[PDB]
Design a protein around this ligand. Structure first.
Ligand SMILES: [Zn+2]
Ligand SMILES: [Zn+2]
Length: 252
């Protein structure tokens, strides 16, 4: 029953249990994890107020598997983002000088907690560490131009993830809200997903082995739109928190 994150503290880089009321992130306690972040974590004894440490991307994923069109049936359409696209909370998304329009896409993210393959939808729960937030950043011109979505979605910084992974949250009916400079762009519930978390894990794990720490982005609701130099994009998911990233365009 925890928020699993990663931190850069005085004593270095570590997993941590991030404790406290969600509406006061400053006064939250980062309780340093020693071993077994995907099993039963044990703790070093050290902790810091969260304000005192750098909050990082909550996982080092070997791959990011993603779902296309998934909000209100056709089979899931999946694609990959390279783990070099991942950044954590508050790290800038850097737009290539030549790419326009570049879109945000707020998404519920699944974090896989153990090696698995050929998992049934009903068994997905036993293989899921928990849930976090992803921003499936996408160069739309490049999507249309390539047909394949890989390049459009694969630029460095195009996979913000965080702020942390919640292990006990039920993904079936959670609100997701995306803001760009405080203006609401996406506003929907995960209960509108065409393929639910179990169906997504069943589908993907029938294709490829999923490893502890692997991320799955489960698709974005209506209201996708452009981001530009100077913008800030915040995605909030109920029961999880808020993933926020500034935006800069290269060459400015
Ligand atoms: Zn709302
Ligand atoms: Zn997406």
């Amino acid at each position: 029953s925890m928020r699993l994150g990663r931190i850069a503290s005085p004593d270095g880089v570590a997993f941590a249990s991030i404790e406290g009321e969600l509406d006061n992130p400053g006064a939250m306690t980062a309780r340093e994890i020693a071993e077994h972040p995907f099993g039963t974590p044990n703790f070093t004894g050290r902790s810091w107020p969260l304000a005192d440490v750098r909050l990082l991307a909550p996982i080092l994923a070997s791959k990011v598997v993603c779902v296309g069109k998934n909000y209100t049936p056709a089979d899931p359409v999946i694609f990959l983002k390279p783990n070099t696209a991942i950044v954590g909370p508050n790290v800038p998304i850097r737009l290539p000088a030549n790419a326009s329009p570049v879109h945000f896409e707020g998404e519920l993210a699944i974090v896989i907690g153990r090696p698995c393959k050929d998992v049934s939808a009903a068994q997905a729960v036993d293989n899921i560490l928990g849930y976090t937030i992803g921003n499936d950043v996408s160069a739309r011109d490049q999507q249309k131009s390539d047909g394949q979505w890989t390049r459009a979605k694969g630029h460095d910084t195009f996979c913000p993830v965080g702020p942390w992974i919640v292990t006990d949250v039920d993904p079936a009916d959670l609100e997701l809200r995306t803001e760009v400079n405080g203006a609401v762009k996406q506003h929907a519930r995960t209960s509108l997903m065409i393929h639910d978390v179990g169906a997504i894990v069943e589908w993907i794990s029938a294709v490829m082995t999923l490893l502890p720490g692997d991320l799955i982005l489960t698709g974005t609701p209506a209201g996708v739109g452009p981001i530009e130099d100077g913008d800030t994009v915040s995605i909030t998911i109920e029961g999880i928190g808020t993933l926020t990233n500034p935006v800069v365009r290269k060459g400015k």
